[PDB]
Amino acid sequence: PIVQNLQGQMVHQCISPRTLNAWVKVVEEKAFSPEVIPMFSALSCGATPQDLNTMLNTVGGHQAAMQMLKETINEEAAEWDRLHPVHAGPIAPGQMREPRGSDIAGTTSTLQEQIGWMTHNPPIPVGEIYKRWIILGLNKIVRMYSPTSILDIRQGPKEPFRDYVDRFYKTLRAEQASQEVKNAATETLLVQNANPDCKTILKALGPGATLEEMMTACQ
Amino acid sequence: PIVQNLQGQMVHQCISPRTLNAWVKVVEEKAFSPEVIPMFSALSCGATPQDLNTMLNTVGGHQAAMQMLKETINEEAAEWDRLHPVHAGPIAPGQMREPRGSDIAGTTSTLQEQIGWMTHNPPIPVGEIYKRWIILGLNKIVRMYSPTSILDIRQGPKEPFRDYVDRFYKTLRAEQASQEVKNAATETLLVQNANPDCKTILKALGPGATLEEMMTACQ
Amino acid sequence: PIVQNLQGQMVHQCISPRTLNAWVKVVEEKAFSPEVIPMFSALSCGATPQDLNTMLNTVGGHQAAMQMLKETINEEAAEWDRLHPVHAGPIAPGQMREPRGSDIAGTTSTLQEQIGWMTHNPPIPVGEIYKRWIILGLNKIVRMYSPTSILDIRQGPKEPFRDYVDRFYKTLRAEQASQEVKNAATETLLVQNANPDCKTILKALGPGATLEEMMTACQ
Amino acid sequence: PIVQNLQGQMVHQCISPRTLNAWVKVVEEKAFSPEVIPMFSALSCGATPQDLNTMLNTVGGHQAAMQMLKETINEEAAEWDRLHPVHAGPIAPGQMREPRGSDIAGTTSTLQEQIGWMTHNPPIPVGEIYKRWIILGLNKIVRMYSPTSILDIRQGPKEPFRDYVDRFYKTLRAEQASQEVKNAATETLLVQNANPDCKTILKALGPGATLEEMMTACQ
Amino acid sequence: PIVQNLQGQMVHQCISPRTLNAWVKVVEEKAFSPEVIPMFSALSCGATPQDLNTMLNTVGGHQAAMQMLKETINEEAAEWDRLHPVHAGPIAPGQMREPRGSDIAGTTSTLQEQIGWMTHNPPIPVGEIYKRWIILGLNKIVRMYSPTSILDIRQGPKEPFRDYVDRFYKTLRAEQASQEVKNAATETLLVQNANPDCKTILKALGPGATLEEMMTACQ
Amino acid sequence: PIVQNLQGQMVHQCISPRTLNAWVKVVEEKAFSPEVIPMFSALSCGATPQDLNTMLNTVGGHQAAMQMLKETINEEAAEWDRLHPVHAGPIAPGQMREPRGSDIAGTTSTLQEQIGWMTHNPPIPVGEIYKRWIILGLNKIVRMYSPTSILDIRQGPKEPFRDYVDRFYKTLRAEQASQEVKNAATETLLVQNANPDCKTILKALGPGATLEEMMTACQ
Ligand SMILES: Nc1ncccc1OCc1ccccc1
Ligand SMILES: Nc1ncccc1OCc1ccccc1
Ligand SMILES: Nc1ncccc1OCc1ccccc1
Ligand SMILES: Nc1ncccc1OCc1ccccc1
Ligand SMILES: Nc1ncccc1OCc1ccccc1
Ligand SMILES: Nc1ncccc1OCc1ccccc1
């Protein structure tokens, strides 16, 4: 990654063993549960495109997902190149060349180049641009690997309301509902999908109940 | 987080793998036992609003609680905006804009903005303001998830007084009794809820007994 | 805690995940065995009153002990206030106010205030003052939770003398005998409580035997 | 490795216990699964040729692979010497000598020499040159140890398409197909090797289907 | 401990959690096997007398040994005071007082005092003086807890010579034979205590055989 | 060890808990498998003779090996003293004395002396000189503890060629064959010791086959 040291200049630092192992172990343990994504983002704080490729290449299984991700990256790299075409032919001696999509993705750029862009005044933030492409891809994978529709999350007859709500919102998160819809669903599908006893209690509460209110009501 | 480095200037540092894992593992192991909250506070020392969102987003289960928390945050953000309305329309070139509720919560502000506020002279402490909203929410969750009323903590016939007192005060903590009431309860409900043999001993001690005195008396 | 950095000025540093986990795990594993206290002291090296409260608040069980500790702290805070009364009414603009008992205990003081006191020339050592109150309380808890009188530690008929001595001194430590008495007991209660065969050997050694001499004698 | 310190000069630092253990444990756990290679590269960030030899020499099993690797290194070292012959006879007093293949590989050069080359202006990047030879060798080993042809990865009758695709691309990675072929295979061998039910669905999708599209189609 | 920081001045640093846990776990796992002593020495590198007491006080079992150690420390402290008597009555304002035995042992000196002595030009090395007393005591404990005389280590009839030699020298180390005697024993007691078949082989080798020679001979 | 700090001067640093534990655990887990030696070398990067003795003294078992090592060290120390005799009688006030064999080995030199030699301009590299003696000794131990002649490593009838080659080269490494012989053995003993089916295949390949070629041939 690129860090500020103890004296305020941005320098390259090697990716640490602890970060490398943390990422590999979260993918091993959680696969593409939605909470893997914020973990990836955090673990890649300050990353170069080299570092991001390191992290992705250290994954051993999930190769269908990693091929899907490559496809998304290639789509974004192609959109970059549409928006920001670069001069063909020789670079000015000693001067910084403009990055292409594949340079942002780390496949045609050197570490030195990357460092140069990321530490330019002002920075050409190749690591953040690439990390956004990656995360776009990873979100597609999360959606793909979500096993259950929201329509199929219904409260069992002896299921504590809290356990049902946990299932409900875990599902909505993997299915990638907007925050609008998660906020909204409390007045709709959450009640509809509740068991008869709790449905009756929630219906009587009236509209505008907070989730806390609904949860206390059906405790 | 924002740290002072080895030379006394406040700079951004990436959240460490160790902090990220510590938080995820405490939620995994303790759920919303009350002692999770001081742990969250400590682990988020120096945090930006970005960091706080990272920590909260890395939680994989407990999604009913995380939706409740979002609701509390939105209520506090709305109260902020009531108290501190911001100018609509264009910001002064190069100048710091005033934060809105959603900027404090990290959803509409960049990391750079956050850094700017937190390192301003004097600081606009967006990470501490947000952390207070979070903790308000988390305390509600703790209360929600407390399984037992204080009224139902009664000393068994062969239960060592110390084990009863441990249950009693663990309950009072999750139920969120004030320190007044925890201090006071030693003269009241603690005795009332003691088994007959210990109740007799405690009654004879007289008023004003310290907890230590009561515990020695019923050992 | 407050640390000297790499250039010799005292600055605040966040409590580390490793320190937070070390404390929680020692209480989990050892409860209030006497050796928990020096561990607490060491783990709280440099602590602010905020840090000390963090450590104590991260404990999840043992709430009878934690309520006893609060009581001891309140007694010491009251004695502080008797000895060092503070001016009522407004503080001099920009100037350091004098700490009250509850400010030393971290309940009515900010982190900034604490830092200010601890880094004043000369320091008002609020973290060390509070740590002493805490340790006074913790020593009471250790004594409370000591399960066995010294009078009941007697060497079994087939018990190796060394194993008996280990029990004996472990007990004396939890019971909180002075070093005088631990030094002295070798000529008295240690022999008295030895089995017949070893008692005979020790009696013949004469007075003034070192523990090493007694242990070799009964090997 | 060679690091920039906190003040921007490149200095030697000892290889850390954590890096040494991370490498040994990845070889122990993963052998020569393809994802070991990016791990080796990352763990050897900044390495001297001494460090690279340390890492390779700390491996205890897999000695057929380590002998193959020595052979590849010797081939590359011989090609170096063909391309960059060095002056025979005495070096200029106090001056940097030119590296031979065996000096790049760390067998005839001192650590000091290595440091000298790597920190020269401009650097003679002996650690990166050697790391490339190593990785050339390791890729041969990965191919050698790949247990299954791509021709033999066929979707079972009750095998979820996603699990088949994972096997398929894991195989292609160990077999060392180019990215061309991995990108291309989605229109060919992937469909051909799919079970009858999914083959029918994929055939109907038409050409140009993304992997995501194919995976959704056969879910 | 007292460390040089990144700029070459000697400053106090808190004892780390990792050092505190390492010591407690080595005593837990190895008790007073001889190799605990060099571990203690290494873990206490740079220690103040405060730190050494911390380490010793964090030990929970082995209280007969810890009382023996206190006795040895008191004997050395008394010998110090015989050799280096201090002025009674008031210290020169602002000036460093001379340490007494109990000040070296950390029982009557403050951390500040200790720091002062250890960082004086030239240092009064109170931590090294005390560490020597401690190690004198610990060596007595090792000898005490050694379970077997060297006379009783004899090679079994089917015991590999190497396993016998390992037992032999492990015993000699716990029994605290000088290096003279360990060097010498190869010509004497080692052969005498060997089984008949190996004894015959060793006798024929002649005098002056190295241990390596003896071990190869009886392989 | 001696390190360069963050500002480029060579200073002493305490051996870390992590390094101390890493060494003890590798000896515990691997004994004197050949790969322990490069691990020892790496873990002792920058070591003083004090540090090297610490590492060796922290080993609890294997005392026959540790006595053999002492013997080798004493032989090298005696050869040093033959080559580099030192002045008898008093040292020049304030000046650096010349090291004797036992000073290099850390038994008659102080840490301060060692530091002085290692940081002299130019250095008298006592830690590297001693580390070479140690490694000479450890290599003898590895050879001693190698359980099997190369002559006895023969491919079983159903043993995969790769598994045989792994055994073969693991053996050659413990037996301490030169790289000449390991390079050469591929044309000789490796084939001779192969099972009949693979022997026939290898014989037909002709001379000059690489190991990779031989391994592919017999897959
Ligand atoms: N293993 C990887 N998986 C997903 C994306 C990228 C990875 O590494 C880099 C890459 C990107 C695009 C094409 C080829 C390689
Ligand atoms: N997972 C989260 N859970 C609770 C609160 C906040 C979290 O992340 C940020 C957030 C806050 C409010 C609305 C949407 C997202
Ligand atoms: N959990 C705590 N337990 C014991 C003492 C203090 C703790 O935190 C601070 C405190 C002290 C006194 C009253 C209230 C809170
Ligand atoms: N164990 C090693 N294995 C593979 C390659 C290199 C290793 O160490 C260095 C080496 C290279 C070439 C010949 C001899 C030694
Ligand atoms: N637990 C201790 N055990 C052995 C020696 C010292 C220890 O702490 C300090 C001490 C030394 C002497 C008397 C009293 C206390
Ligand atoms: N345990 C040790 N084992 C092997 C060699 C050295 C060790 O420590 C130092 C030493 C060397 C020579 C004689 C005595 C002690």
- Give, in degrees to the nearest 5, the angle at Cα F97 between F94 and F100: 160
**Residues in CB range of E131: below 8 A, 6 or more apart:** E41, E44, E47, E52
- The CATH code that applies to domain E1-149 is 1.10.375.10
Fold of C150-219: 1.10.1200
- Residue whose tokens read 């902090």: B19
Dist. CA A48–CA A57, nearest whole Å: 14
Q: Which long-range contacts (CB under 8 A, 24 or more apart) does C196-205 make?
A: C198/C155, C198/C161
Residue C147: how many other CB atoms lie within 10 Å: 8
Task: List, in sequence order, every residue forming a beta bridge with C12; answer none if it has no partner.
Answer: C2
DSSP-derived 3-state class of residue A210? coil
Stretch (H or E) spanning E90: none
Q: Could you tell me which residues are beta bridge partners of residue F10?
A: F4
- C72 CA distance to ligand 1 centroid (A)? 61
Q: In Å, what is the CA distance from B92 to each residue of A128, B111, B112, C23? A: 26, 19, 17, 49
Among all chains, which residue has been given the structure tokens 């506070």? B41
For chain B, the chains sharing at least 3 beta-carbon pairs closer than 8 angstroms are A, C
Residue written as token pair 């945050």: B73
Classify D142 as helix, strand or coil. Answer: helix
Number of C-beta neighbours around residue A102 at 10 A = 17
Nearest protein CA to atom 14 of ligand 1, as residue: A70
Q: Which two tokens stand for residue F43?
A: 């873990």
Would you call C18 and E20 a contact, using CB atoms and an 8 Å cutoff?
Answer: no
Q: Distance of CA A79 to CAs A108, A129, B177, C213, Å?
A: 17, 12, 58, 86
* Rounded Cα distance, C141 and B216, in Å: 11
Give the max Cα distance, chain E: 76
Nearest to B58 among A7, A39, A210 (CB): A39
The C-alpha atoms of residue C166 and residue C164 are separated, in whole angstroms, by 5
Interface size A-B, in CB pairs within 8 Å, comes to 83
Question: Closest Cα partner for E44 from F153, D110, F14, C127?
Answer: F14
Q: How far is the CA of A52 from the centre of ligand 1 (A)?
A: 9
Residue ranges matching CATH 1.10.1200.30 in chain E: 150-219
Return the bridge partners of C11, or none: C3
Q: Which of left, alpha, beta for A89 (phi over 0: left; psi -120 to 50: alpha)?
A: left
**How far apart (Å, rounded) are the C-alpha atoms in residues A76 and A129?**
10
Q: Which residue has the tokens 């070893």?
A: C198
Interface of E with F (CB under 8 A): 1, 3-4, 6-8, 16, 18-19, 22, 30, 33-35, 38-39, 41-43, 45-46, 162, 165-166, 168-170, 172-173, 179, 182-183, 186, 210-212, 215-216
Tell me if A77 sits within 8 A of A101, measured CB to CB. Answer: yes
**Are E126 and C198 spatial neighbours (Cβ–Cβ below 8 Å)?**
no
Contact E41, F54 (CB under 8 A): yes
Q: F51, F178, F211: which to substitute to probe chain D, counting the most D Cβ within 10 Å?
A: F211
Dihedral (CA of B98, B100, B101, B105) sign: negative
Contacts of D128 (CB under 8 A, 6+ apart): none
Question: Do the Cβ atoms of E61 and C18 come within 8 Å?
Answer: no
Q: Which ligand is nearest to the CA of E56?
A: 5
Is residue A68 a contact partner of residue D212, using CB atoms and an 8 Å limit? yes
Token match 């172990």: residue? A25
Mutate to test the pocket of ligand 5, among E27, E51, E57 (most ligand atoms within 8 A of CB): E57
Of A53, A59, A71, the CB nearest to D212: A71
CA torsion sign for D118, D123, D124, D125 is: positive
Residue C212, token pair as written in the block: 């090493």
Nearest CA in chain D to A10: D8
CA–CA separation, A29 vs E210, rounded Å? 54
Q: Tell me the two tokens of residue E50.
A: 């405060």
The chains found to touch D (3+ Cβ pairs under 8 angstroms) are A, F
Rounded Cα–Cα distance for residues A110 and C137 (Å): 61
* Cα distances (angstroms) measured from residue A139 to each of A26, A180, A181, A185: 16, 18, 17, 21
Q: How far apart are CA E49 and CA E124, in angstroms?
A: 12
Any bridge partners for residue B3, and if so which? B11
d(CA D30, CA D170): 14
Q: For residue B104, count other CB atoms closer than 10 A to its CB.
A: 29
Delimiting residues of CATH 1.10.375.10 domain(s) in chain C: 1-149
Residues C44/C55, Cβ–Cβ less than 8 Å? yes
**Which neighbouring-strand residues pair with E2?**
E12
What is the CB neighbour count within 10 angstroms for residue F102? Answer: 17
Tell me the DSSP string of B91-135. PPTTPPPPPPHHHHTTSSS-HHHHHHHHHSSS---HHHHHHHHHH
Counted across chains D and F, CB pairs separated by less than 8 A come out at 83
Alpha-carbon gap, residue F179 to F137, rounded angstroms: 20
Q: Which residue of E has its CA nearest to F4?
A: E6
Taking phi over 0 as left and psi of -120 to 50 as alpha, with beta for the rest, B189 belongs to: alpha
3-state secondary structure chain C: CEEECCCCCEEECCCCHHHHHHHHHHHHHHCCCCCHHHHHHHHCCCCCHHHHHHHHHCCCCCHHHHHHHHHHHHHHHHHHHHHCCCCCCCCCCCCCCCCCHHHHCCCCCCHHHHHHHHHCCCCCCHHHHHHHHHHHHHHHHHHHHCCCCHHHCCCCCCCCHHHHHHHHHHHHHHHCCCHHHHHHCCCCHHHHCCCHHHHHHHHHHCCCCCHHHHHHHCC
- What tokens appear for C66 in the block? 């934690």
Rounded to the nearest angstrom, the distance between the alpha carbon of A70 and the centre of ligand 1 is 5
Distance CA E174, CA C219 (A): 16
Please list, residue by residue across D172-210, b when 16 or more beta carbons sit within 10 angstroms of its beta carbon and e when fewer do. Answer: bbbbebeeeebeebbeebbbebbbeebeebbeeeeeebe
**For chain F, what is the HEC assignment?**
CEEECCCCCEEECCCCHHHHHHHHHHHHHHCCCCCHHHHHHHHCCCCCHHHHHHHHHCCCCCHHHHHHHHHHHHHHHHHHHHHCCCCCCCCCCCCCCCCCHHHHCCCCCCHHHHHHHHHCCCCCCHHHHHHHHHHHHHHHHHHHHCCCCHHHCCCCCCCCHHHHHHHHHHHHHHHCCCHHHHHHCCCCHHHHCCCHHHHHHHHHHCCCCCHHHHHHHCC
Query: Is the bond leading into E123 cis (omega within 30 degrees of zero)?
Result: no
Q: Would you state the structure tokens that stand for residue B207, as one six-digit string?
A: 């008023």
Among B146, B148, B151, B149, CA closest to B192: B151
Structural tokens at position A34: 């939605």
Asked if residue F27 has its Cβ within 6 Å of ligand 6, the reply is no
The single residue listed with the structure tokens 């007393």 is E133
Asked if A165 and A211 touch (Cβ cutoff 8 Å), the reply is yes
Residue D72: both structure tokens together: 């590849």
Cα distance from B80 to chain C (closest Cα, Å)? 22
Could you tell me which of F117, A171, A209, C38 has the C-alpha nearest to residue E15? Answer: C38
d(CA B138, CA B127): 16
Q: How many CA atoms lie within 13 A of D11 on its CB side?
A: 16
Residue with tokens 């008191």: E74
Residues 6+ apart with CB under 8 A from D141: D32, D65, D68, D69
Q: Chains touching chain F at 3 or more Cβ pairs under 8 angstroms?
A: D, E
In the block, residue with structure tokens 């490694």:
F135
Neighbour count for residue D58 (Cβ, 10 Å): 21
Residue A143 contacts by C-beta under 8 Å, 6 or more apart in sequence? A174, A175, A176
Only one residue has tokens 């530091």, namely F115
Give the H or E element holding residue A10.
strand A10-12
Residues of E in contact with F7 (CB under 8 A): 6-7
CA distance F55 to F49: 10
CB-count burial class (<10 Å; 0-12, 13-18, 19+) for C149:
exposed
Instruction: Determine the distance separating the centroid of ligand 5 and the alpha carbon of E134, expressed in angstroms.
Output: 9
Omega of the bond prior to A122 within 30 degrees of 0, cis? Answer: yes
Please state, in angstroms and as integers, the Cα–Cα distance from residue F61 to each residue in D58, E35, E166, following that order. Answer: 22, 9, 7
**Length of chain E in residues, anyone?**
219
Please count the other Cβ atoms lying within 10 Å of the Cβ belonging to residue D140.
18
Q: For the CA atoms of chain B, what is the radius of gyration?
A: 23
CA distance B162 to B217: 11
What phi and psi, each to the nearest 5 degrees, are found at residue A110?
-85, 165
Breakpoints of chain C, after residues (C–N > 2.5 Å): none
Ligand 1, residue A73: give the atom nearest the CA.
12
Is the shortest distance between the CB of B174 and ligand 2 below 6 Å? no
What's the number of CA atoms in the CB half-sphere (13 Å) around residue F179? 7
Please choose from F36, F69, F72, F103 the residue to mutate so as to test ligand 6's pocket, defined by most ligand atoms within 8 A of CB: F69
Burial C40-57 (b: 16+ CB within 10 A, else e): bbbbbbbbbbbbbbbbbb
H-run or E-run covering A187: none
Chain B residues inside the 8 Å CB shell of A30: 60
| Nearest residue to F172 (alpha-carbon basis) of F144, F148, F195 | F148
Helix spans in chain E (H): 17-30, 36-43, 49-57, 63-83, 101-104, 111-119, 126-145, 161-175, 179-184, 189-192, 196-205, 211-217
Beta carbons within 8 Å of D160's beta carbon, 6+ residues apart: none
Minimal CA separation from C191 to chain B, in Å: 29
Contact A45 B14 (CB under 8 A): yes
**Which-ligand-closest: CA of A52?**
1
Torsion of CA F43, F49, F54, F55, to 10 degrees: 30
HSE (side-chain half, CA atoms, 13 Å) at C67: 31
**CB within 6 Å of ligand 5 — which residues?**
C 179; E 53, 56-57, 66, 69-70, 73, 105, 107
**F33 in contact with ligand 6, CB cutoff 6 A:** no
Q: Is the CB of C66 under 6 A from ligand 3?
A: yes
How many CA atoms does the CB half-sphere of B7 hold within 13 Å? 11
Do residues E142 and E175 lie in contact, with contact meaning Cβ atoms separated by under 8 Å? no
**Of D98, D94, D95, D89, nearest in space to D129 by CA:** D98
